[PDB]
Structure formats: C-alpha cells, structure tokens
C-alpha cells in the first residue's frame, strides 16, 4: 500500500462543522488520540508504520507517553470496529521551535492494511496555492450539524496567508509556518476535537498531508477561516526524527 492512496475512494463534499460523513475507511491515515479511559480528544495522521503526526497542544499538558493511545482504522468514535488497531505511544517529540506540531512514535508498528495506510509527506517548503480545494477530517464538534460520532470530512479551499492575515480576517495572527483554509462565508470548519488531524490535498494520484488542524477564532464563523500548521515547513524535522529514533 503506497502512501496517500485510499482503498475506499473518498466522497466529494463541495458546498467538523458542516461537511459530510466520510465513506468508512476512505481516510485510512486518520488517527484518533485517546485518554487512558478511552475518550477521543484529538486527531492525528499516520505518516509511516511507526509514526503519527499531531498537534503539540494536544499533548503538551500531559507529556508522558503512557497517557495516550492511538486508534487506527476506525470510523465510529465509540463502540469501535472489530479490526481497529489500538497502539500505545512509546515516545513524544515536540517541534523544537515550539510550533503546534508533534510526533508520536508507536510502541509497535501499525499493520498496514486496506483500512490503515499512511498519508504522503509534501515536498519541503512547498506552499499550497490559494484556492486549492483540500480535505479536513475528524471526529470533532459539529455545532448542531449532522454526523456526530462518525468520521466527518470538510472539503475546503486554501486561503493564501497574505489574504488570511488581512485586518478583516485573522489580522496578522497567521505565521508563514501556518496556512489558512475554509470558506470566508462560514458554515464549514474543523472544530474542537479535530485538532491534530489532517488537511490533505490531492496531487496527481494521491493525497499529500499539507496541514495539521490547529486553531481558529471559533469555528465556521464568517471571515474566520481555520488555521493549520503548514506541514511542508517541518518535513526536514519530521524525517530527521524518524531516521534517528
């Protein structure tokens, strides 16, 4: 199984708050991060059999790796599928310049199956173009929209930083190591519970991980697009950690 190529073809959703319920296992890199009592609190992205990429703020207030478990291959949030892989975390690596991104080393390698496949990493320092339609997935808050309890997806366009940072929108808050995605009209967004999961953009024949869900001014509000850590600016760090640990 090559990276970024689901064995169930994803549904499109032109037009997680809003969006739609994903086809089961069409996002086989989506991870659920769980407390010791099994509560989902963040997403993550499998990027190789032993490594999950997530957001630093999902973990930083409880650094000990035994505090976390990783659920792979799931579609429902509760009452997990039978062949779901639950794997413990052996090591945690926070990004050294203190961006909102972090690596989890799994205590044993995930078994790569038709339901558990890594996303591809982008080219270093690639800047996803303005208006590129990408996909954001997770089990987070739906703000009254349908699909709570099931893996949801939002199809949202990238908004280039120079637009997103305008006074009327996020007013200078967005760093070059972040990107914006969403509809400025509002209505569709990642929300609480989605942090740490993927924003992927289809390129040629596979999905490339371009963002890590991070923050926003609320969710799905007009003029307030979601902010994601820009993965391409950390590919060298990610590959260094994986090769040396």
């Amino acid at each position: 199984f090559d990276c970024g190529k689901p064995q169930v073809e994803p549904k499109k959703c032109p037009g997680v708050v809003g969006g739609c319920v994903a086809h089961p296992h069409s996002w086989p890199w989506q991870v659920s991060l769980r407390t010791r009592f099994g509560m989902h609190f963040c997403g993550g992205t499998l990027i190789s059999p032993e490594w999950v990429l997530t957001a630093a703020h999902c973990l930083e207030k409880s650094p000990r790796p035994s505090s976390y478990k990783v659920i792979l291959g799931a579609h429902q949030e509760v009452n997990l599928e039978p062949h779901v892989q639950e794997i413990e975390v052996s090591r945690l690596f926070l990004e050294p310049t203190r961006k909102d991104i972090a690596l989890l080393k799994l205590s044993s390698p995930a078994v790569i199956t038709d339901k558990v496949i890594p996303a591809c990493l982008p080219s270093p320092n690639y800047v996803v173009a303005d208006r590129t339609e990408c996909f954001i997935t997770g089990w987070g808050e739906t703000q009254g929209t349908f699909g709570a309890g099931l893996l949801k997806e939002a199809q949202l366009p990238v908004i280039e930083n120079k637009v997103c940072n305008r006074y009327e929108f996020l007013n200078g808050r967005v760093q070059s190591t972040e990107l914006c995605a969403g509809h400025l009209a509002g209505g569709t967004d990642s929300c609480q519970g989605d942090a740490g999961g993927p924003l992927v953009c289809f390129e040629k024949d596979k999905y490339i991980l371009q963002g890590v869900t991070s923050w926003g001014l609320g969710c799905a509000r007009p003029n307030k697009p979601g902010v994601y850590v820009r993965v391409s600016r950390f590919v060298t760090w990610i590959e260094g950690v994986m090769r040396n640990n």
Partner: peptide, 14 residues
C-alpha cells in the same frame, strides 16, 4: 479569541 481545537479546546482572550 484563539481557540485551539483539542477537546476540550484551549481558548484565550485574544
């Protein structure tokens, strides 16, 4: 006004 999107979220006055 930032809310980081964990569950529960990490929110600030900014």
């Amino acid at each position: 006004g930032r809310c980081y999107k964990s569950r529960p979220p990490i929110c600030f006055p900014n």
